[PDB]
Amino acid sequence: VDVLLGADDGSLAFVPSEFSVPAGEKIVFKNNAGFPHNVLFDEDAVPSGVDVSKISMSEEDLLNAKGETFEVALSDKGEYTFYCSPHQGAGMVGKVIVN
Ligand SMILES: [Cu+2]
16 A cells, blocks of 8 residues: 655645554555655564564664655554654654554
């Protein structure tokens, strides 16, 4: 499934902000507008047994150009919160439900 980083109108949103995916489907975060963005998972809001380090960009690593991607596949079922490091305080956070 593709998730845009930044709305076309410059909003600091993942698009979609919430969605479900079957376990193991590739999620393609696609840099879109209103850079820089990156994608990390919140160690306090993922299913028990998930290691966010394996599924998160390094916080120091930013996507500054349209069409860069960050790709991840989530095998454990449950709710995960992801966020953009530079924009976390501006509400650029999302939820994926893996089913
Ligand atoms: Cu961002």
